[PDB]
Design a protein around this ligand. Structure first.
Ligand SMILES: OC[C@@H]1O[C@@H](O)[C@H](O)[C@H]1O
Ligand SMILES: [Zn+2]
Ligand SMILES: [Zn+2]
Ligand SMILES: [Zn+2]
Ligand SMILES: [Zn+2]
Ligand SMILES: [Zn+2]
Ligand SMILES: [Zn+2]
Ligand SMILES: [Zn+2]
Length: 304
């Protein structure tokens, strides 16, 4: 058998549960003794789980870093022990050289770029300003930093679009509502809302409704991930644009775990594809989704 030690961020978003399910299911399917762990959103619990895998003498450890910083010591402790590290979706802020074999994930900057370009293409003939409200991700995580940056690059070529308000909602529906209701009270006029993970955008669409305002027409929503519940919102008309982030890493993580453990060469970075849908596109996209996605993943590209 091959032993894989995986430590997860938590289970905040629908994307996370899909990512977890895809990792656990793909291990069975490929035949890998998975020693999965859940930090529940706190780095110290992710560290501990990574530290326990070293003491359990696992063959290859792999994790999804809750926040970019703080890993230096632990990532060097795995290199001392000789167990290789394969990273998933979120990146790290590390100094030391060759502290991880590869990193499977997505291009969060273009995901944000894609959204911001959408806002802009739609508000081209805007006779007056357009008020964008940003529901930021967990403070410190790679997707939250990179999406914010990309979304700005999208807006930048049009001064009529300005981020009137921006605040963290921790990638949850709770936070997504809590922060959106605050923007509904504080900011007087909102033309569109950018949710860094449809989950916050869903909590936000409850706040749009709860304040007697129509989602998808009064205030337009535009988000990332393309989860079931999100895609359904768009299919109905409560959302306007979702940019797909692929959660089904499992199959490739297992392939790369076999390659790494054996010692076969692996590319330095693998980026999963992305697409985006309008209401009508999402309507036709909703049917055999788990197959369509698992097929999309197979079309990944390498950064050797
Ligand atoms: O790391 C990827 C992000 O993590 C999840 O919490 C978000 O939904 C997803 O976009
Ligand atoms: Zn299952
Ligand atoms: Zn160091
Ligand atoms: Zn579902
Ligand atoms: Zn797809
Ligand atoms: Zn490949
Ligand atoms: Zn290649
Ligand atoms: Zn590329």
């Amino acid at each position: 058998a091959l032993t894989l030690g995986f430590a997860q961020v938590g289970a905040e978003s629908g994307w996370r549960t899909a990512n977890t399910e895809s990792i656990k299911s793909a291990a069975e399917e490929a035949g890998v003794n998975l020693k999965f762990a859940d930090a529940n959103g706190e780095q110290e619990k992710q560290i501990s789980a990574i530290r326990s895998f070293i003491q359990q003498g696992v063959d290859v450890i792999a994790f999804s870093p809750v926040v970019r910083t703080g890993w230096d010591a632990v990532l060097q402790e795995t290199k001392n022990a000789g167990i290789p590290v394969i990273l998933t979706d979120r990146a790290v802020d590390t100094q030391d050289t060759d502290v991880y074999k590869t990193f499977i994930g997505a291009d969060f900057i273009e995901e944000g770029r894609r959204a911001g370009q959408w806002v802009a293409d739609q508000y081209a003939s805007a006779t007056g300003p357009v008020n964008i409200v940003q529901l930021e991700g967990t403070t410190g995580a790679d997707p939250a930093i990179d999406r914010k940056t990309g979304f700005a690059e999208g807006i930048s070529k049009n001064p009529n679009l300005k981020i009137v308000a921006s605040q963290t909602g921790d990638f949850t529906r709770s936070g997504g509502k809590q922060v959106m209701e605050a923007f509904l009270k504080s900011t007087p006029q909102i033309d569109v809302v950018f949710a860094q993970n449809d989950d916050m955008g869903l909590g936000a669409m409850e706040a749009i409704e709860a304040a007697g305002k129509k989602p998808g027409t009064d205030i337009k929503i535009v988000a990332v991930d393309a989860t079931h519940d999100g895609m359904q919102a768009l299919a109905d008309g409560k959302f306007n644009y979702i940019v797909e982030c692929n959660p089904l890493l499992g199959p490739e993580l297992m392939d790369l775990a076999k390659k790494v453990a054996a010692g076969e060469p692996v590319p330095e970075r693998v980026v999963t594809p992305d697409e985006a849908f309008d209401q009508a596109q999402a309507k036709a996209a909703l049917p055999n989704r788990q197959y369509k996605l698992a097929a999309a993943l197979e079309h990944h590209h390498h950064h050797h």
